[PDB]
Ligand binder design. Structure first.
Ligand code: HEM
Ligand code: HEM
Ligand SMILES: [Cl-]
Ligand SMILES: [Cl-]
Ligand code: NA
Ligand code: NA
Lengths: 713, 713
């Protein structure tokens, strides 16, 4: 069946904006997972999970009688797809159970792990999501094996179809670098937004870069990929050595024995894959990665044995039974237990990437400190495990249940508690009047609130106007935010704030975070007034101001908009067409195609463009809220051509006279080109639509203002 | 960016079931197009359309000063994608404005036609859909040129994204037959459900079959493709000769002059395509098909000149200026006007396919009768034009506005008016009790109502339980419907009906159509009771009983379900996997993936399978409404293998003992295999889901019962 994608493989795909509709969701439209989870008996779930750890099933027998290692790996793979560049991946949507992640080579036999959990999932039903359960099970595994965790939050609602994520362009699983779709270029520079070294891996190749077993060069890949998942050196050593304190790898025979991954397997396999022809195909004969390493003398108990072995032996390069590169301890006794035969013992072994923790000079210093101070290792690993598994969950207001850690961590982009009465409707009206009386323009007010609110991304629920981080480093200096204009707006707003707060009795005060948004609302109201419409824009107080010390400047860098079609902004020249970057931004902002359409058309006529560019400002009444963008865009009296100077900028001229009427970018003119976006533009550009446009604009404006407002959820 | 479809190109695609979500729709959730249209000033729209016909735009100058022909072609292409086999295509959703149709080669320069219409669309906004406007514009063209149409109905709501339709497997536009993805096999047999001879054509190739200019062989293609669009010989002659009474073709210069279709064109083209480098690229120089034929002496006026020319001259083969095969009357004077130069005249010309109407022996008899009796020609053309343009609009209850023809046509599958009071809630309860007291079983009742209701297809809104056509030829003898069991059930229900109706006063009576549905509702209520649950299934009366004489048997054949996964039924062995045919059926029934899942699991345990097959009957309490299907399907204690005898049937055996527990088909086991469908099955198979399962089952049951009830809309 030949499809539109076949005929026109480069046409913009909007269906990413209409994923996760009410159609595909089995739960009713009013289902509220937070309310279901809050009533769950989490303690009972945890008792069932503890019991599961040593309830071995014959179709996938437990190594050492204990599934803990398998489940820690499962939870670490669930979280381990996360990329800081876009916030996509991570554990927060339970995407491990869908394509393609359910079938990535690095997730082999995690289909078994998830299936072991079906009886518990089934028992508790909608009160615990798969997404939460995968993480909880990892926690319980740790606790079962003697490791005290830092805590756990519930609240990850299940999703019902695959997320659309760019995982790379390679057409071959696990393809080594330098191919026609190479994710590397230059001096081993991995293309953004990717955070793995090969298609179908979590972070790095356990044999070494492109399979070459050099622990020092492996360390460079580890550092880069882990940093692209928001982890620093200390967290990275703590995680890898913490994890490999438990369990084992599986490589008992050649990988050619292993059959189709789950999405390719026959229907009779009932959702499982990697069926193996090697001996029993499971247990002592299991094949997963192809490596055959067991790190510690007590693989089912927390210990300090990982760093004792790493430093205590010298290492020799050898091959697993499947042919993979791994290491064995020179001259060692057979001290490591076998997973099934009490009469067998094995020498200590390690992966290339384990040796990285010793032979990279910066990791060596950390590893040595953890070896000498095992309590530092345990605390670091607990904290890093919590971060790993919660990094995409968003603000602390989303965290549910009785095990939430009280300690507030820098990586959570924390927001101070509000300890005072909030402004009411009369106050908001007074503040809006003061804002409009100050002389701040519609363009200033709309631009500033847009800049504050539109840093939100739904992928990891970071960003948004809560916190007033626009006034701090680094947001105050982002090019998109027009740093000099921004400073003048903020100065004026802070004066208004100080005067209002100084006049209050009791402890009533307004945050700058709230006032920035309320001021934007006033701008939109004034713009509607300019166009002859009487509009009140909703506003919900309760944001607080974060401090600079509560704002990690390095971690904030990934939120910088280098492309924001809603402000007709592109920081540089990119491979990806600007319209593709627009749809990508709309998806991060959780907008549908209609919402994207209405919002962009309104922003253009309100003066939200960066640099006061005329591109796409298709109105003779700037700073009035009208549907002029759509009416003028769709006027067939105007003919469009790319400029001689810049093929990505277009001139619209009167067809009869040749007079210049407008200029526009690709982001502007895509709404007149793409057949689905033009259909939407037509609705808003029709003679009966001025009021619909205004109302739909106010709604999407308010949606964007409230994207991070989980304190209201 | 590599996708799931790249990795696993043969996995089932569910996204066809979640098109047309509220997310992609710009209109409010409460928007009702029928209510908007019913207030349109239709007469005003038609006055503006009339004016447009002779208001030439310089960017696409009107031939002969009149756009009528162009607009008739536009409206015939809008309707002419329709296939009777599945009901897909047709004018009824305005899909000509989206990919791929907007860019099919046979739709070249219809982008210009749609663009001419934007000012009128813009003026009337949401009160007239594009879908309605395209057809209305064709009618107005006809009327403006002196042709009396049969009428017009509004009510085609706009859609907002491309429909998923199988248009063929060729990867090359217009590929001639006999290629690697040939749509022909055997003795020129076109594969169902296709109704065109080449990818990107409407019906046939105007030069002749695969470009061979033989009118006699062209006629065979015409007949076949028109029949697959539900038109017989008389309708086909009337439509081709009627249309080619107007306007002209365009082939002024070589086709290599014509550039990229709209979906491939640059963004500056603003949704238009086929830009030509030949001379002025438009008007006198236009290139569309590559043919250069003008049929009549008055291309802007209704006449009987098409047949006067066809029969009045002898024809010779010649080439257009683009090199295409066409025919000319060399003995003729130059009597045909030029489209732009009043000083030029041309000889009569014809397409190969026009000559088919004279040199096919069956068409010649009809053509000759139309030639000698042009009033008969006009009436047949009017009737066929109405049918063509309304064939996918559904029941007459959907028809809106002041121009609906009063005559009821057999092709409309008409339903008699109801002229008597309807049963009320108490009566429905009395009837349900009577049905259950008759001895009819839950299986009989559910199977019969399913059979009656599930003939509906949303593609052309044909079928459904209204009419009680299950009692008539041919439905009563379809193998899926279990003709002997069905006869027994209907006899019993008819006796109940007769008794109830005989006891009433005041004219109150129940139709058999209603009672079949109500009896199915009773079956579902009894099944719920069997499982220990009291529920009431909603029921809406007002269906009526059609007669055999009001039922075209031939046209009913395409509604026969040869695959119905909801009854585990496959009439024969097909190339397409049964699970694909299930998703296709769900799409036709307008079901989402969740609704498909709930419905199938319930039907299995109610005894709806054809032949009382045990395949998929994963319960020990058949005829009780429970979630047993999902609980048992998802039990990892059962292991599934394909049978030796039939690779498409599976045995589920206890994993420990080997005892046979169940058998299933692909349709059954896909819900345990496909990662999205298994996720849905898990919701319904969880310990907290009994109540949700029953509620969601009753809701989707009711939805299927009411699919054709546009009298309630
Ligand atoms: C450089 C980063 C890492 C690499 C290259 C790596 C590699 C591997 C490989 C190849 C396996 C064997 C899979 C099999 O054959 O069954 C494995 C197992 C495992 N990994 Fe790691 N890993 C990494 C980081 C982590 C982290 C951060 C954790 C958790 C905090 C983790 C915990 C585990 C556990 C517990 C197992 C044992 C699974 C079992 O007993 O079945 N690993 N890892
Ligand atoms: C065997 C079936 C038919 C074939 C092969 C066919 C073929 C064609 C072709 C090649 C053109 C020229 C397009 C161009 O170069 O501009 C055309 C024009 C046209 N066709 Fe047909 N046609 C068929 C049936 C119909 C029907 C059923 C109607 C309407 C009832 C219709 C109405 C027209 C009209 C009005 C035009 C003139 C367009 C103009 O003036 O711009 N045709 N047809
Ligand atoms: Cl994701
Ligand atoms: Cl369709
Ligand atoms: Na994410
Ligand atoms: Na259709």
């Amino acid at each position: 069946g030949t499809s539109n994608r076949d005929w026109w493989p480069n046409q913009l795909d909007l269906s990413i904006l209409h994923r996760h509709s009410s159609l595909s969701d089995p739960m009713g439209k009013d289902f509220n997972y937070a309310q279901a989870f809050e009533k769950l008996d989490l303690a009972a779930v945890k008792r069932d999970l503890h019991a599961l750890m040593t309830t071995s099933q014959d179709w996938w027998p437990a190594d050492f009688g204990h599934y803990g290692g398998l489940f820690i790996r499962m939870a670490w793979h669930s979280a381990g797809t996360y990329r800081t560049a876009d916030g996509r991946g991570g554990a927060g949507e339970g995407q491990q159970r869908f394509a393609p992640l359910n079938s990535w080579p690095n997730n082999a036999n995690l289909d078994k792990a998830r299936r072991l959990l079906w009886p518990i999932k089934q028992k508790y039903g909608r009160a615990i999501s798969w997404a939460d359960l995968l993480i909880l099970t990892g926690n319980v595994a740790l606790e079962s094996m003697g490791f005290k965790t830092f805590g756990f939050a519930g609240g990850r609602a299940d999703t019902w179809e695959p997320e659309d994520v760019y995982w790379g362009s390679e057409k071959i699983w696990l393809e080594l670098s330098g191919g026609p779709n190479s994710r590397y270029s230059g001096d081993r520079q991995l293309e953004n937004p990717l955070a793995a070294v090969q298609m179908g891996l979590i972070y790095v190749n356990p044999e070494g870069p492109d399979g070459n077993p050099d622990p020092v060069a492996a360390a460079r890949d580890i550092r880069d990929t882990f940093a692209r998942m928001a982890m620093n050196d200390e967290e990275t050593v703590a995680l890898i050595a913490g994890g490999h304190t438990f369990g084992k790898t599986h490589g008992a025979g050649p990988a050619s024995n292993v059959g189709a991954e789950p999405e390719a397997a026959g229907i009779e396999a009932q959702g499982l894959g990697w069926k193996s022809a090697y001996r029993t195909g499971k247990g002592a004969d299991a094949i997963t990665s192809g490596l055959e390493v067991t790190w510690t003398t007590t693989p089912t108990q927390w210990s300090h044995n990982f760093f004792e072995n790493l430093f205590g032996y010298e290492w020799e390069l050898t091959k697993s039974p499947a042919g993979a590169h791994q290491w064995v301890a020179k001259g060692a006794d057979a001290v490591i237990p076998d997973a099934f035969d009490p009469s067998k013992k094995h020498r200590p072994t390690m992966l290339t990437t384990d040796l990285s923790l010793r032979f990279d000079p910066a990791y060596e210093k950390i590893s040595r400190r953890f070896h000498e101070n095992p309590e530092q290792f345990a605390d670091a690993f607990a904290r890093a495990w919590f971060k790993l598994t919660h990094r995409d969950m968003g603000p602390r207001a989303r965290y549910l249940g009785p095990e939430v850690p009280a300690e507030v961590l820098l990586w959570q982009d924390p927001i101070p508690a509000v300890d005072h009465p909030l402004i009411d409707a009369a106050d908001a009206a007074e503040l809006k009047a003061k804002v409009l009386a100050s002389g701040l323009t519609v363009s200033q007010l709309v631009s500033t609130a847009w800049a504050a609110a539109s840093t939100f991304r739904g992928s990891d629920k970071r960003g948004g106007a809560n916190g007033a981080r626009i006034r701090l480093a680094p947001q105050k200096d982002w090019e998109a935010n027009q740093p000099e204009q921004l400073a003048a707006v903020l100065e004026t707003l802070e004066a208004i704030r100080t005067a209002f707060n100084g006049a209050q009795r009791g402890g009533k005060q307004v945050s700058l975070a709230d006032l920035i948004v309320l001021a934007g609302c006033a701008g939109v109201e004034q713009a509607a007034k300019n166009a002859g419409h009487a509009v009140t824009v909703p506003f919900a107080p309760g944001r607080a101001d974060a401090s600079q010390e509560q704002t990690d400047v390095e971690s904030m860098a990934v939120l910088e908009p280098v492309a924001d079609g809603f402000r007709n902004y592109l920081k540089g020249k990119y491979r990806v067409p600007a319209e593709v970057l627009l749809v990508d931004k709309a998806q991060l902002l959780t907008l549908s195609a209609p919402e994207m359409t209405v919002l962009l058309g309104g922003l253009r006529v309100l003066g939200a463009n960066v640099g006061q560019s005329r591109h796409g400002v298709f109105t003779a009444r700037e700073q009035a809220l009208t549907n002029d963008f759509f009416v003028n865009l769709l006027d067939m009296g105007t003919e469009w051509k790319p400029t001689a100077a810049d093929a990505d900028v277009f001139e619209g001229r009167d067809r009869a006279t040749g007079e210049l009427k407008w200029t526009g970018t690709r982001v502007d003119l895509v709404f007149g080109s793409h057949s689905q976006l033009r259909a939407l533009a037509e609705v808003y550009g029709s003679a009966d639509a001025q009021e619909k446009f205004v109302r739909d604009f106010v709604a999407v404006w308010n949606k964007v203002m409230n994207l991070d407002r989980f304190d209201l959820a």
